[PDB]
Design a protein around this ligand. Structure first.
Ligand code: CPS
Ligand code: CPS
Ligand code: MG
Length: 438
């Protein structure tokens, strides 16, 4: 009666390897790189693709590697592909990724989740979202010099070919960085008028906080290298977590992410990896303290077992003479047949970079920003065959397209916000990135 286990193959490697270089070498083979700090020190992970997967295309349809239209939304198709290769959980997590899919989702996935929101294709016509079958990974402990290949049981060949083609060169990545030759941004009036319009909704009492953003761009003389950009940004800000996703012409460099959702053996968690929820204040003696709970919020609470959900402070808003403590469900145990798409649907996009209440804030964001957010406040990361998943919210994140780098920054508007100050805060957030582009 004892359950068959499916431990992943794990081969220790000759010597430390350069994952960035390795990706730069064969981007097609290595669609996603992620860096982390254990509670140890630094490490990295590079996912190895095998060539199947799914994409949500600009015509609003999902397709696979054979360009066949899969019916439904990206998250339905993703759920069918996961069921098809689903594994049962073996209860061990030394190793956080064990094979399954690299995921990248733009913010605009949200209109498939809440179809009240107008759908938007990417301007460049590339895929809004991707799920890439990845049956192996390369890991690199920074603390201990150790590198490994890991692959799903039954992938001995692929594992072999990777042990081959690691320790084979190391041309050495992310060199030839050229600073940009022009820099640009949305006309500032668009933002400050957006803020004034946000403040009408806040004064009406229908929303309590809204993350309003604006787009920045940098133009270069020669085509940009995603890994060279990545290296610039990591040097300039060595944040604990980061990554780089690249495939299908999407090139998404993340320099300061937050956790969107983590699931380990059905235990789902949304708490900031930082450890501390965000505080939002405007530009205004004993403050009032009101706890606010959105009773219709669609979140982990809808997909978890009763008696397991933990509630905690999502964010605070502090204006005039009050502090509102915005509380939501932050972790729980999933019902046993909850699918990865349903966890994504319950959690995406995060509440602190849209607003509260979430859906109404997304409609205001959509009307005021007028263009897709792309990777900004989207997510990427991975899904294991056993359903474990790790997705990050993309906050300090740039996209590369040929000679152009773009990125958005935003400010959490609250009822006593000052429009020109919020504008300054968006520029203060862009400064760090623009510095590093130098
Ligand atoms: C020195 C600092 C902080 C170390 C610390 O303070 N601890 C660490 C933290 C993140 C590291 C970079 C990223 O990994 C990406 C990239 C991988 C390539 O392979 C080699 C280059 C590069 C830029 C790395 C170099 C360097 O190592 C960084 C900046
Ligand atoms: C007993 C209570 C809740 C009772 C319940 O679910 N009864 C139906 C609803 C009753 N309530 C409304 C009264 C409460 C809570 C407290 C601790 C919980 C368990 C463990 O942490 C992990 C474990 C993993 C599996 O996946 C199956 C689920 C199981 C058993 C967890 C959910 C379960 O429920 C437990 C027993
Ligand atoms: Mg104040």
């Amino acid at each position: 009666g004892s359950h068959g286990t499916h431990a992943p193959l794990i081969h220790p490697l000759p010597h430390p390897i350069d994952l960035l270089a390795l990706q730069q070498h064969d981007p097609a083979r290595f669609p996603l790189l992620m860096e982390s700090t254990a509670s140890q020190g630094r490490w990295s992970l590079l996912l190895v693709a095998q060539g199947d997967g799914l994409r949500l295309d600009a015509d609003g349809q999902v397709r696979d590697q054979h360009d066949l239209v899969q019916p439904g939304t990206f998250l339905q198709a993703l759920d069918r592909a996961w069921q098809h290769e689903r594994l049962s959980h073996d209860g061990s997590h030394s190793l956080p990724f064990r094979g399954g899919w690299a995921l990248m989702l733009d913010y605009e996935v949200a209109s498939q989740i809440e179809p009240v929101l107008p759908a938007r294709a990417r301007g460049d016509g590339r895929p809004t979202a991707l799920a890439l079958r990845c049956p192996a990974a390369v890991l690199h402990d920074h603390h201990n010099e150790a590198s490994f290949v890991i692959a799903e049981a039954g992938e001995q060949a692929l594992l072999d070919a990777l042990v081959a083609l690691a320790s084979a060169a190391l041309p050495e990545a992310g060199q030839g960085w050229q600073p940009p030759q022009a820099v640009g941004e949305d006309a500032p009036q668009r933002f400050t008028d957006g803020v004034r319009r946000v403040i009408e909704y806040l004064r009406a009492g229908d929303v309590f906080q809204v993350n309003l953003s604006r787009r920045w761009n940098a133009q270069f003389a020669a085509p940009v290298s995603p890994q060279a950009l990545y290296a610039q940004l990591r040097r300039a800000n060595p944040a604990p977590f980061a990554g780089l996703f690249s495939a299908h012409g999407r090139h998404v460099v993340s320099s300061s992410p937050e956790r969107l959702v983590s699931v380990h053996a059905g235990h789902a968690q949304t708490r900031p990896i930082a450890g501390t929820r965000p505080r939002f204040e405007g530009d205004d003696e004993r403050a009032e303290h009101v706890m606010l709970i959105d009773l219709e919020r669609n979140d982990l609470g809808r997909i978890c077992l009763p008696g397991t959900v933990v509630v905690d402070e999502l964010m605070t808003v502090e204006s005039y003479a009050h502090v509102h403590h915005i509380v939501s469900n932050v972790s729980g145990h999933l019902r046993p047949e909850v699918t990865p798409g349903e966890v994504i649907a319950a959690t995406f996009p995060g509440g602190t970079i849209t607003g509260c209440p979430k859906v109404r804030c997304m409609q205001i964001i959509s009307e005021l920003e007028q263009v897709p957010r792309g990777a900004y406040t989207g997510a990427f990361g991975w899904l294991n065959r056993d359903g474990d998943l790790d997705l990050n919210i993309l906050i300090r994140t740039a996209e590369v397209d040929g000679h152009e780098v773009s990125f958005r920054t935003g400010a959490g508007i609250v009822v006593d916000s000052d429009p020109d100050k919020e504008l300054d805060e968006t520029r203060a957030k862009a400064r760090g990135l623009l510095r590093a582009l130098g």
